[PDB]
Amino acid sequence: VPRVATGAGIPTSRQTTVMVSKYSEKSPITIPFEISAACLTHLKETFE
Amino acid sequence: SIRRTGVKTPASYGKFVLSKENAVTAIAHHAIMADFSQHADRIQQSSQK
Amino acid sequence: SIRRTGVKTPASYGKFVLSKENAVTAIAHHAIMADFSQHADRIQQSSQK
């Protein structure tokens, strides 16, 4: 913090030691996708 | 007051890549502290630098 | 059965010391893990050794 005090009869300030903390927030993203088992089977066995 | 402008931009992610020692710290007391060995240098050096 | 003989003994106390690497563990969370630098080599080494 800065400081300024002044005059006579005017109030003053003591030490304000500031240690602030800011946090995180989780938001995991997720998409699905579908693959047909016949489409995989063409990779699997690969017929005549 | 608008231009279509070629602007520099990062093509890559950054890397918060833990020290292996920092992983030792996180298994020790669950508090990753950024630049741990650099803070150790500041202990063997001036504290508030 | 009692024999009165000169016994080899230590002439000083032990040293347990806070490393540069170990002192950051203090100002993180006040609790000190001994050999804190030694386990640092262990994580870039295998799982447990």
Place this chain on the structure above:
Amino acid sequence: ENWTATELLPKLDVPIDLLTHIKLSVGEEMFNNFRLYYGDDPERYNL
């Protein structure tokens, strides 16, 4: 404790000393502040 440090970091396989048996020792708190797992512990890998 923060037992995960003992769970992952290397051990002090050392000359040890037990009174009766270690399960009875920790079930009489001959040892102070123990921890005990019959199973293949999965909690050392979630951190």
Place this chain on the structure above:
Amino acid sequence: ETTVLVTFEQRLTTGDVGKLSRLIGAVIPIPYRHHLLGSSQVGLDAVVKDKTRDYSRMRARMREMTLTIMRRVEGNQMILGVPTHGQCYTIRNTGPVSWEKGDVLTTLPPVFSGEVTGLVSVSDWDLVLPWIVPMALATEINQRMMMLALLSLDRSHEEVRAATAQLRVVRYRDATLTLPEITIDDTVLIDMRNVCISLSMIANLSSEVTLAYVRKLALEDSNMLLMKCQEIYNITPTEELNKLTALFVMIRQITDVISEQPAFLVCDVSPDDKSALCIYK
């Protein structure tokens, strides 16, 4: 001795010593006043867990305690400087009263609105601190203990409880505390006698000028104090001097019955209203 290094002797935590690290300047009483003490004695909690546990025995006990000021809390060492009479010391607030700069503070046993964990119930032992109240709440909370002990003299069994609940919610500055379900105890009774004796002698010394002063004032004036107190000659002044003075012996004593020890007198209060420079043990 003045500086009191304290053994913790219990199994404390990091969350313990972090609290006292921000509490440096708190008021801890010690009974023995060594340089080296243990936390069995250090702290006030070890007597507020008694089995009788009324305000009558806790208040009269801790006036034999010796207050200290929390210093140098790192790890397991507690520096407690015994304050000297008349130096300026700052005090961190232990009870939610703002202390209102310029006044005398005292020592209140324990909150006794439940049993507050003063630090943390470590191994089923917490370190509970006294309340340091600004002597108006101290005298008032000691007044009502004898107000409701004089009440239980001439009530049967229920108009005590219908009138204690009228008087137990003490709405003070920042605080609405609770009288501790007033137990009739003999330390009150030995001093409730001398109060009733002190009320008797003021009736004797009231020499018909000090008596009729309000009852002559209501004929002439219309004041807020004068109207609420409606519901509620001789050429011997030299004798009226001695009767008023002997009346002043009683009221400086009957106040001293319900007043407490004068203690930390406020030098300054921070705008945080937490740390308070104070003189005069």
